[PDB]
RNA sequence: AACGCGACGAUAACCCGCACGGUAGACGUAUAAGAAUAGGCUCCGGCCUCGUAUCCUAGCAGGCGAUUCCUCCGCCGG
């Protein structure tokens, strides 16, 4: 959704007498800005605890570059999604120079061939694929094969949209 | 060239082989050069051109009418 | 002999007037500057004098010819349509006939 | 003055607009060649020589090379050309002269009988063609020196297809 | 890039129908006179038996049809497939609709006035640079057959002529651009070498 | 097609009077290969993303006379 970023979103409950200094959840929150992965993140948090957004508070929210964002790598994302039949766990993997560029990928990818949206998508975990051979799938496979090159046949030039009419026949040779 | 070479280790292939040097004589880089010279042409030196392919014609007319 | 033109304006074309689906202002009119793709390059003719120059079957000065002024405002669209405001509103049978862009005033 | 006001005919207000002095564009220089855009001269190239006021422009041809006078014409219908010439040896007290705004400015028989007759063109005077002479004599003699100006300067300005003049580089 | 001609040709061969269509209605409006050769090497998308129920389904939803002006009509030439696909597009219940298609002039072939006059095409409607490779095309030629255009022999006979022809305009091209390049060879001894470079620094 | 079209045959003039010099849109309104787009062109050297090209383009809306050029354009005949 958008130009989303890495967001470390950090909060706890609202102390009490009973219980000073809680317990300081942490959690990593993929969002386009920091109301989004602040709502993200109390989401999750009463899904699985009793915690909520009017007894809680944010301590703080940081957002998570790439260390080495000129370097490609492969990505290994895990997914869960609820359909009309339910909820169903997947495994997808892509090939980008960052993480936050691979679940750009995910939600494009994930829109089109299954049509789930933002809210049913939950992120479990993306790793980066360390080592070949922990690829296990096969359009990545061809592409960190030994020596790749392809040629680029049909390729349609760029004819500008305002020039309507055209003297020579183009070519799609380049 | 190495897959994956950072920065400097393409530019020691990139001085090594002249890239700059065969790009200038590719002939993708002198329909630029041309068309860059055309574009910057003034009203004046329009004015020049057309006095001056006029001339150059003339020289053209003569040799066509011999041929 | 020249052989030469005397033309100083650029060509254009009345395409209609600023309108919606349905409810169409003729004080606002639509010009096609010849050679204008962008926006960028309308940005050039704002402001600029625009002429439409008709014939009427009658002589009143010693010619047919009558001219309606005007002047280009604001550009329209992406692609370097522009919006022309003149004296009196366009006909509405001006639709697709040339108009007259000269070049001044001028800030070249 | 002599009536007392005859109406209640208010007078206006002082309004607070003082007159300063207009700044040309940096392309304007003296010396610069000028292509006419409006009136009788359109389409014709011609060499400024100094800036008056309120934005107009006094410039000369000069009248041998293409016909153009000593004239004023407005900053907004010219175009300013890159080409630049010599402006030494001319008189500068000349240009200040033919500067001036008094300058390009300024019932009987006869009255009654020339009503609907055409008035007749009348010449040039003395002082008009000697001081167009008087400025131009240092300047085509500049322009000489520079090759292709004077047919530069004869020629007319004018659009061919593909000419367009967002693109064209003056 | 936004040019104004007087009358523009276009080529029919290897342009995808409503596309085509689309664009030249635009134009029309815009006033620009539009002539229209090869309507018969026109393509429409998809394999030709869709073209056949789509031709088949016009004819459905019509009681009574007009022998002469429509129905079964409209199909039998590629040019009138073509002005009936242009007419759809511009308002021609309005006087500016009927002033636009007296701009249209669409004919099967290249007639003589129009064989010895420049024939451009639209990039955004060529089939090659519009259409995947693996897809399938049929020509209006084609579908227009199969309803009953009579004359598909008859344009093919006198386009194989004019190719005829010009093949022997090139050859008299060929000749000219042998001289031309010889005379420019010729004349660079004598040319004035002070202006040659000055023409360099300039572009020509 | 009597309210579509082609070819061909035969085919309406002098005098007197008297009323006026359109077109949905010219302004350089210049530009003919064909064919393919998992190819093609050629001068046989080479060349193709690019028509962002080619031709034409100076002078009283474009005069006069020269110096100077046999280049370009136009009209009539074969």
């Known amino acids: 959704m958008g130009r989303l970023q890495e967001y470390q979103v950090i909060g706890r409950?609202?102390?009490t007498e009973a219980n000073p200094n809680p317990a300081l959840y942490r959690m990593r929150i993929f969002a386009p800005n920091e109301v989004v992965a602040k709502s993200r993140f109390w989401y999750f948090l009463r899904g699985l605890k009793k915690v909520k957004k009017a007894t809680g508070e944010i301590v703080s929210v940081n957002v998570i570059s790439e260390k080495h964002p000129l370097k490609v790598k492969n990505f290994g994302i895990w997914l869960r999604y609820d359909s009309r039949s339910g909820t169903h766990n997947m495994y997808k993997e892509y090939r980008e120079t960052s993480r936050v560029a691979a679940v750009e990928a995910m939600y494009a990818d994930m829109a089109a061939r299954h049509r789930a949206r933002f809210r049913s998508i939950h992120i479990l975990k993306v790793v980066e694929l360390e080592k070949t051979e922990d690829v296990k799938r096969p359009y990545i496979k061809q592409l960190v094969a030994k020596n790749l090159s392809f040629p680029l046949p049909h390729r349609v030039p760029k004819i500008s949209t305002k020039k309507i009419f055209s003297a020579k026949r183009p070519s799609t040779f380049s | 060239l190495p897959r994956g070479a950072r920065?400097?280790?393409?530019?020691?292939?990139?001085?090594?082989?002249?890239?700059?040097?065969?790009?200038?004589?590719?002939?993708?880089?002198?329909?630029?050069?041309?068309?860059?010279?055309?574009?910057?042409?003034?009203?004046?030196?329009?004015?020049?051109?057309?006095?001056?392919?006029?001339?150059?014609?003339?020289?053209?007319?003569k040799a066509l009418a011999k041929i | 002999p020249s052989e030469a033109g005397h033309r100083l304006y650029v060509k254009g074309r009345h395409l209609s007037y600023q309108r919606g689906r349905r409810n169409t202002h003729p004080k606002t009119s639509l010009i096609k500057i010849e050679g204008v793709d962008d926006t960028a390059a309308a940005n050039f003719y704002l402001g600029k004098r625009v002429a439409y120059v008709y014939r009427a079957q009658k002589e009143v000065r010693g010619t047919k010819i009558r001219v309606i002024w005007g002047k280009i405002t604001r550009p329209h669209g992406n692609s370097g349509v522009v919006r022309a405001k003149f004296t009196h509103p366009l006909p509405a049978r001006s639709f697709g006939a040339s108009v007259r862009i000269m070049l001044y005033p001028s800030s070249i | 003055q002599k009536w007392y006001p005859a109406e209640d005919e208010a007078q206006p207000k002082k309004v607070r607009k003082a007159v300063r002095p207009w700044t040309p564009r940096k392309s304007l220089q003296p010396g610069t060649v000028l292509i006419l855009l409006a009136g009788r001269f359109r389409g014709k190239r011609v060499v400024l020589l100094k800036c008056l006021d309120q934005g107009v422009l006094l410039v000369t041809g000069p009248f041998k090379i293409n016909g153009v006078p000593l004239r004023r014409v407005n900053a907004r219908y010219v175009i300013a050309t890159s080409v630049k010439v010599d402006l030494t040896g001319v008189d500068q007290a000349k240009i200040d002269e033919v500067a001036q705004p008094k300058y390009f400015t300024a019932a009987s028989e006869e009255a009654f009988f020339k009503q609907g007759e055409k008035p007749q063109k009348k010449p040039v005077s003395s002082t008009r063609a000697a001081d167009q002479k008087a400025i131009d004599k240092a300047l085509i003699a500049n322009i000489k020196k520079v090759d292709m100006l004077a047919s530069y300067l004869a020629s007319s300005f004018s659009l061919r297809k593909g000419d367009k003049p967002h693109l064209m580089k003056f | 890039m936004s040019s104004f001609e007087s009358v523009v040709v276009i080529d029919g061969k290897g342009h995808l129908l409503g596309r085509l269509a689309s664009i030249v209605a635009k134009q029309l409006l815009s006033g620009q006179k539009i002539v229209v050769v090869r309507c018969e090497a026109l393509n429409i998308s998809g394999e030709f038996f869709r073209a056949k129920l789509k031709y088949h389904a016009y004819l459905r939803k019509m009681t009574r049809y007009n022998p002469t002006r429509g129905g079964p009509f409209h199909f039998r030439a590629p040019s009138r497939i073509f002005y009936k696909a242009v007419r759809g597009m511009i308002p021609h219940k309005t006087a500016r609709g009927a002033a636009a298609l007296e701009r249209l002039k669409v004919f099967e072939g290249v007639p003589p006035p129009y064989d010895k006059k420049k024939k451009m095409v639209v990039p955004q409607a060529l089939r090659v640079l519009r259409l995947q490779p693996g897809r399938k095309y049929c020509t209006v030629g084609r579908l227009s057959h199969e309803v009953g255009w009579k004359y598909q022999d008859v344009v093919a006979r006198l386009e194989?002529?004019?190719?005829?022809?010009?093949?022997?305009?090139?050859?008299?091209?060929?000749?000219?651009?042998?001289?031309?390049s010889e005379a420019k060879k010729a004349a660079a001894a004598k040319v004035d070498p002070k202006v040659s470079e000055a023409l360099a620094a300039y572009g020509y």
């Open chain 2, 7 to 61: 920065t400097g280790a393409v530019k020691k292939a990139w001085e090594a082989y002249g890239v700059d040097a065969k790009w200038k004589e590719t002939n993708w880089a002198k329909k630029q050069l041309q068309q860059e010279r055309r574009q910057s042409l003034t009203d004046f030196d329009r004015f020049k051109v057309m006095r001056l392919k006029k001339q150059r014609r003339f020289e053209e007319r």
């Open chain 5, 160 to 180: 194989e002529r004019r190719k005829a022809k010009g093949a022997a305009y090139y050859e008299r091209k060929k000749l000219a651009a042998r001289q031309l």
């Open chain 1, 13 to 15: 409950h609202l102390p």
